[PDB]
Chain length 57, copies 4
């Protein structure tokens, strides 16, 4: 599995079967972009995970 | 002063005479972007601040 | 003004008349803590700012 | 596997064989605490991962 990771395509570790994309906004000026290989999403996070190469945006 | 703040334009409080845009990566899969109104940046990152409306593109 | 900034005490720039301590959790496994000198907080989070040395414990 | 997750002990998903602890400091006022279940650490992150219940701090 290969996933996008902030301008790089990285190869996932054998135990990372998913690519992931999510964003966070904890403070008015602060945005977080979580992008990369990952393990399984939460139930709440169901669509933040994808299983195909380079699928994470 | 007005500044960009993650897709919107916000009006700054009186004591905030700067627009800021700083981009970090504290972990490989996590990017952080500070964008909004601000007080003065430090000298080391002096250019991270600008002082005109919508300057922090 | 002096404020706590993640285990240290820093002197604030002239235009920063507040100490701030805000704690967020944009993802379940990720906590974010803002602690340092600051300009004025918003009304909605008015109490997140204080105005005396080392007030932002 | 059970790991600490910001004041909670959570049960890891079958594909999360590790607990994880790390911190990030991308900006002078900003500290990040990454704590929870995880998949395998990077090579650079070798000691941020642990394999026993509640081992992540």
């Amino acid at each position: 599995l290969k996933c996008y990771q902030h301008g790089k395509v990285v190869t996932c570790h054998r135990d990372m079967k998913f690519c992931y994309h999510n964003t966070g906004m904890p403070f008015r000026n602060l945005k977080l972009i979580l992008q990369g290989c990952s393990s399984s999403c939460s139930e709440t996070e169901n669509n933040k995970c994808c299983s195909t190469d380079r699928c994470n945006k």
